[PDB]
Amino acid sequence: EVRTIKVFTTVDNINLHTQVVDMSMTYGQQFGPTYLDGADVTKIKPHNSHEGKTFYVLPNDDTLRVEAFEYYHTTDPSFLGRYMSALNHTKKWKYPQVNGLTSIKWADNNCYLATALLTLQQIELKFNPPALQDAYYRARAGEAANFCALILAYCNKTVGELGDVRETMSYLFQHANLDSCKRVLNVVCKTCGQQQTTLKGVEAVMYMGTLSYEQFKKGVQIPCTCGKQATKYLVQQESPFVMMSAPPAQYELKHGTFTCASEYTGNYQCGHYKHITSKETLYCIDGALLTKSSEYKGPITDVFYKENSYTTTIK
Amino acid sequence: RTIKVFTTVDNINLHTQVVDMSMTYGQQFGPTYLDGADVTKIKPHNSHEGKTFYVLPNDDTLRVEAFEYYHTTDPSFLGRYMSALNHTKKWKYPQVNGLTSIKWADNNCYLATALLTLQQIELKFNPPALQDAYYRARAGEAANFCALILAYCNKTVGELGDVRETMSYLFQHANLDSCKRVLNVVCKTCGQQQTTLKGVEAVMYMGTLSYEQFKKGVQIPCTCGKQATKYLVQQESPFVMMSAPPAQYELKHGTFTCASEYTGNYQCGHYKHITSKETLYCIDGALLTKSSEYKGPITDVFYKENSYTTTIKPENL
Ligand SMILES: [Cl-]
Ligand SMILES: [Zn+2]
Ligand SMILES: [Zn+2]
Numbered sequence: 001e002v003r004t005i006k007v008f009t010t011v012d013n014i015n016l017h018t019q020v021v022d023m024s025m026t027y028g029q030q031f032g033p034t035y036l037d038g039a040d041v042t043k044i045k046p047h048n049s050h051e052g053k054t055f056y057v058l059p060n061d062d063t064l065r066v067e068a069f070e071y072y073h074t075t076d077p078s079f080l081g082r083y084m085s086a087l088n089h090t091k092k093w094k095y096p097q098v099n100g101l102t103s104i105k106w107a108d109n110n111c112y113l114a115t116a117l118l119t120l121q122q123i124e125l126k127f128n129p130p131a132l133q134d135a136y137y138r139a140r141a142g143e144a145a146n147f148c149a150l151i152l153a154y155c156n157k158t159v160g161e162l163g164d165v166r167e168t169m170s171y172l173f174q175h176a177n178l179d180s181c182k183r184v185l186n187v188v189c190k191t192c193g194q195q196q197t198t199l200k201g202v203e204a205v206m207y208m209g210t211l212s213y214e215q216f217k218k219g220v221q222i223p224c225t226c227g228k229q230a231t232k233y234l235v236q237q238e239s240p241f242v243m244m245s246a247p248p249a250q251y252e253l254k255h256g257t258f259t260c261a262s263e264y265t266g267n268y269q270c271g272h273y274k275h276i277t278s279k280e281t282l283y284c285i286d287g288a289l290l291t292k293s294s295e296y297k298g299p300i301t302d303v304f305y306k307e308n309s310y311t312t313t314i315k
Numbered sequence: 316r317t318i319k320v321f322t323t324v325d326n327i328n329l330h331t332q333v334v335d336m337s338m339t340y341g342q343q344f345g346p347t348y349l350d351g352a353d354v355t356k357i358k359p360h361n362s363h364e365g366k367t368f369y370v371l372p373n374d375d376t377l378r379v380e381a382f383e384y385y386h387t388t389d390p391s392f393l394g395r396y397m398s399a400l401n402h403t404k405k406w407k408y409p410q411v412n413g414l415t416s417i418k419w420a421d422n423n424c425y426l427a428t429a430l431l432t433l434q435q436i437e438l439k440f441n442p443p444a445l446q447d448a449y450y451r452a453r454a455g456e457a458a459n460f461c462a463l464i465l466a467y468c469n470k471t472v473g474e475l476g477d478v479r480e481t482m483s484y485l486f487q488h489a490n491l492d493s494c495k496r497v498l499n500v501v502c503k504t505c506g507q508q509q510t511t512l513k514g515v516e517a518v519m520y521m522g523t524l525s526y527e528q529f530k531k532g533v534q535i536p537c538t539c540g541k542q543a544t545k546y547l548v549q550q551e552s553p554f555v556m557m558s559a560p561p562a563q564y565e566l567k568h569g570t571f572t573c574a575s576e577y578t579g580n581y582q583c584g585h586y587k588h589i590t591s592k593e594t595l596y597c598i599d600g601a602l603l604t605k606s607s608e609y610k611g612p613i614t615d616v617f618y619k620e621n622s623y624t625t626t627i628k629p630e631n632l
C-alpha cells in the first residue's frame with residue numbers, strides 16, 4: 001500500500017532529522033518547500049536514490065523553529081524562504097579575489113553588496129548569528145553566495161533592488177557584537193549652554209553628516225533647538241572602527257588616512273556603488289574591476305576608519 | 316545699494332546674507348530661487364530685502380539640513396523641487412466634497428487623485444518636508460506638497476504620471492512599520508507555501524481590484540506547470556491598495572473607500588477619483604458628480620482595514 005524511503009531534513013544543515021517519506025506523495029505535500037543541495041524538489045516525488053540524503057525544509061514545527069532561531073537569530077517564519085529565494089540568484093554570481101579581497105562580479109544591481117562585503121573584510125567585526133558568522137568565513141574564502149543571500153534576507157531586500165550601503169551596514173551591525181562600543185559627544189551653543197550625550201552599540205559607530213573623522217573630533221556645525229547654529233564634537237570613542245556617512249558631493253581620499261570608502265555614481269534612483277581601499281596605495285575595486293591611483297576624488301557616501309580608544313584633548 | 320536676505324535649503328534654517336544690487340544672485344550664491352522662480356540671472360531689487368531665497372545644498376552643513384528635512388541625498392532634488400513649485404504654486408486647489416482637489420492643468424490628474432486618496436486613508440509621512448506640506452495641503456494650500464511629490468517621483472510638471480507608481484514612491488516615505496501581510500499559495504501537486512510581506516509590499520497588490528477576491532483566492536501559475544491558488548491569510552494595516560490593469564469595473568457604494576479611474580493608454584490618458592460617501596462621488600479635478608452607481612475603467616481601489624485573518628482551511632481548496 002505505502003512504499004517509503006528514509007531521508008534527513010534540516011533548517012541549518014547541522015541538526016539532521018530522520019523522516020520516513022511516502023514515495024507516492026511529493027516532497028511539497030509532505031514537508032512544504034523542499035530543497036536538495038539548493039535545488040528545488042518541492043514538485044517531485046521521492047526516488048530510491050534520495051535515500052539517506054539531507055533536505056532543507058522551512059521551519060513548520062516547534063523543533064525546527066527553535067533550531068532556526070538558534071542558527072539565524074530570527075523569529076520571522078518567512079526568513080528561510082526569502083534566504084532560499086535570494087540564494088537561487090547569488091549561487092550563480094562570481095566571487096573573484098580582487099586585490100586580495102573577495103569581491104562580487106556585477107550582477108542584478110549587486111554593487112552595494114560588493115562594497116559591503118569588501119568593507120567587512122577590512123574592519124574588525126564578529127557576527128552573533130551562527131549562520132552569519134559561518135557564511136562570512138566561507139565568503140572570505142571566495143564562496144560568498146550564502147553570505148550575500150543572508151544579507152538580503154536580514155535586510156528584507158530582494159535580488160535586483162537598489163541597496164543603500166549605510167542602511168545595509170546598519171542592519172548587519174545589529175547582528176554584530178557591538179554592545180561594548182561607546183561614544184560620548186558634546187554640543188555647545190552660545191546663549192544655550194553645553195550638553196553631553198552618550199551612545200552605545202550601533203549608534204556609537206555610525207554618524208551621518210560628515211565623512212571626516214577628524215572633522216567630527218574638531219567639531220561640526222549643527223542647528224540648535226532655539227534655531228541658531230551650535231557645535232557638536234566627539235569627546236570619547238571606544239570601538240574597533242567608526243563609519244562616517246554623508247550625502248555625496250566631491251570628497252578627496254588620501255592614502256593612509258582611512259580604511260576604505262564607498263562611492264555612489266550614475267542615475268540617483270538606480271545608481272552604482274564602487275569601493276575604494278587604502279593599501280600601500282589607493283585601489284578602486286569596482287566589482288571584478290580594479291584600478292590603482294595615488295589619490296581619489298568623487299561622490300563618496302561612506303568612509304570607514306580604524307579605531308580603538310580615543311579621548312579628546314580639547315576643552 | 317546692499318540689502319540683507321535669508322538663504323535656506325529647508326525654509327526652516329534661515330541663513331542671513333548681504334547681497335549687492337550690482338551683481339546677480341547667481342554670482343553671489345550660485346543657483347538661487349524665490350518661491351520656486353529661478354532668480355540666478357537676476358539682480359537684487361529693493362523689494363527683495365528680508366525675503367527668503369532657496370539655494371542649492373553646496374556645503375556639508377547645507378547637505379545635512381536638506382537630508383534631515385527631505386530624507387533624500389540626491390543633489391538634484393532642490394532644483395527639481397523648485398522647478399515644479401514654480402508651476403504648482405499657480406495651480407488651483409478647490410475644496411470638492413470636503414477634500415482638497417486640483418483643477419486640471421499640466422496632466423496633473425494623477426496627482427489630484429493621489430492627493431484626494433491620501434486625505435481618506437490613515438498615513439503618516441516620515442520626511443518633515445512631506446509632513447509639513449501635507450498638513451498645508453489638507454487645509455487647501457497644496458502647492459508645496461504637489462511639487463514635493465513630483466520631485467520625489469522624478470517627474471516634471473506636464474508629464475503624465477501613474478497613480479500606482481506615485482503611491483509606491485510616497486508609501487516608501489511613509490511609516491508602514493506596523494504593516495504586515497501573510498499570503499498562502501496552494502498547489503494540488505506542490506502543497507502550501509506561506510510568505511510574509513512588509514512595508515509597501517504589505518499594502519500594495521497588483522493583479523486584482525477586488526479585496527474580497529484576494530481573500531477568496533486568485534489563480535496563478537505554479538512552477539510545476541499547474542495552476543495554484545493564492546490568497547490572503549493575515550493582514551495588519553489601516554488600509555490596502557488593490558491594483559490591476561484598467562478594465563471596466565462596477566464600484567458598489569459602501570464596499571470600498573475610494574478608487575482611481577483611468578481612460579486612455581500607455582502614452583496618454585486621464586485619471587478621475589471615485590469616493591464612497593453616503594453615495595458615490597466622482598471627483599474630476601474641480602468637477603463633482605454624484606451617482607447611486609458607478610462603472611468605469613478602474614485601475615486602483617483602496618479599502619479600509621485593521622486586522623484580518625482568513626477562515627480558509629487549506630484542505631478545503
Ligand atoms: Cl489632467
Ligand atoms: Zn541654541
Ligand atoms: Zn505546483
Ligand SMILES: [Zn+2]
Nearest residue numbers: 422424585586
Ligand atoms: Zn488628466
